[PDB]
Amino acid sequence: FKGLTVLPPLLTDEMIAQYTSALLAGTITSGWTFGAGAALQIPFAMQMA
Amino acid sequence: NHNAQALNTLVKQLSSKFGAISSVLNDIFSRLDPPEAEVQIDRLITGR
Amino acid sequence: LYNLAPFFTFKCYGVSPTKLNDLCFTNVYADSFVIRGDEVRQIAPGQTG
Amino acid sequence: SFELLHAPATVCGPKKSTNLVKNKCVNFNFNGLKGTGVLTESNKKFLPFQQFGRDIADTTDAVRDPQTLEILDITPCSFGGVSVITPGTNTSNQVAVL
Ligand SMILES: *[C@@H]1O[C@H](CO)[C@@H](O)[C@H](O)[C@H]1NC(C)=O
Numbered sequence: 001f002k003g004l005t006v007l008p009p010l011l012t013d014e015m016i017a018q019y020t021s022a023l024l025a026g027t028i029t030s031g032w033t034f035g036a037g038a039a040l041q042i043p044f045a046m047q048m049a
Numbered sequence: 050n051h052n053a054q055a056l057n058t059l060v061k062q063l064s065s066k067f068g069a070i071s072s073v074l075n076d077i078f079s080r081l082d083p084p085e086a087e088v089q090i091d092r093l094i095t096g097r
Numbered sequence: 098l099y100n101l102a103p104f105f106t107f108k109c110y111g112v113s114p115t116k117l118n119d120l121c122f123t124n125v126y127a128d129s130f131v132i133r134g135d136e137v138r139q140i141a142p143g144q145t146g
Numbered sequence: 147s148f149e150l151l152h153a154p155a156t157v158c159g160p161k162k163s164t165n166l167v168k169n170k171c172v173n174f175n176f177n178g179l180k181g182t183g184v185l186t187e188s189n190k191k192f193l194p195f196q197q198f199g200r201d202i203a204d205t206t207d208a209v210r211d212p213q214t215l216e217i218l219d220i221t222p223c224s225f226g227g228v229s230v231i232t233p234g235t236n237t238s239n240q241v242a243v244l
């Protein structure tokens with residue numbers, strides 16, 4: 001080279017995908033409750049109501 | 050694309066002479082006296 | 098050539114006399130002609146006369 | 147009057163000749179071309195009239211041998227950055243290096 005290199009990111013794409021999967025599972029299963037304290041389950045129909 | 054173009058132009062700009070006789074340090078040192086090659090090296094260093 | 102003692106003008110343009118031993122020349126013209134003593138002034142580049 | 151560019155060149159001063167070294171980081175002087183680099187086998191389809199090649203990224207990748215007429219790729223031998231991992235002076239003096 002000419003002294004110009006690229007450094008790898010700390011978080012791999014698999015880790016980011018895991019974070020996204022966790023967010024999707026939490027929001028599908030517990031609504032907005034998981035973002036304000038303990039995650040409380042609720043059926044999806046009642047959540048959308 | 051912006052990152053790639055910035056790095057590519059940084060690589061490409063080395064070929065310019067910046068007013069010196071040549072853009073290669075080895076030639077300047079090989080075919081000039083040190084008192085006369087000093088100014089050429091200074092010009093290239095400042096440009097880079 | 099350095100064995101010749103009476104050298105009067107030895108100026109070089111773009112090259113150093115001491116660095117000639119380590120250089121190679123793709124083509125060199127031994128353009129030679131005999132001149133008057135003071136005419137060495139006009140043998141210079143970008144100079145009229 | 148003379149032209150000062152690189153090869154081809156038919157006029158040279160007195161000098162010595164040394165053999166070929168392959169995959170060793172070696173200081174070299176080819177026909178007045180000073181530098182440092184490692185020479186490796188070239189798979190590039192260099193044409194017979196190609197003297198020295200600035201193929202990619204405007205870099206003097208190759209120079210043709212004045213005796214064996216082989217395509218000698220010129221690359222600088224390996225270099226890189228060094229990082230130091232430490233747990234802290236108050237804790238220990240052990241050090242890991244990256
Ligand atoms: C001498 O140099 C010429 C120039 O290319 C080359 O063709 C020839 O093979 C060389 N001879 C030897 C014995 O290396």
Ligand SMILES: *[C@@H]1O[C@H](CO)[C@@H](O)[C@H](O)[C@H]1NC(C)=O
Nearest residue numbers: 232233234235236237238239
């Ligand atoms: C300095 O040493 C003390 C004693 O072990 C430790 O508790 C402290 O964390 C150290 N300082 C820092 C900035 O870690």
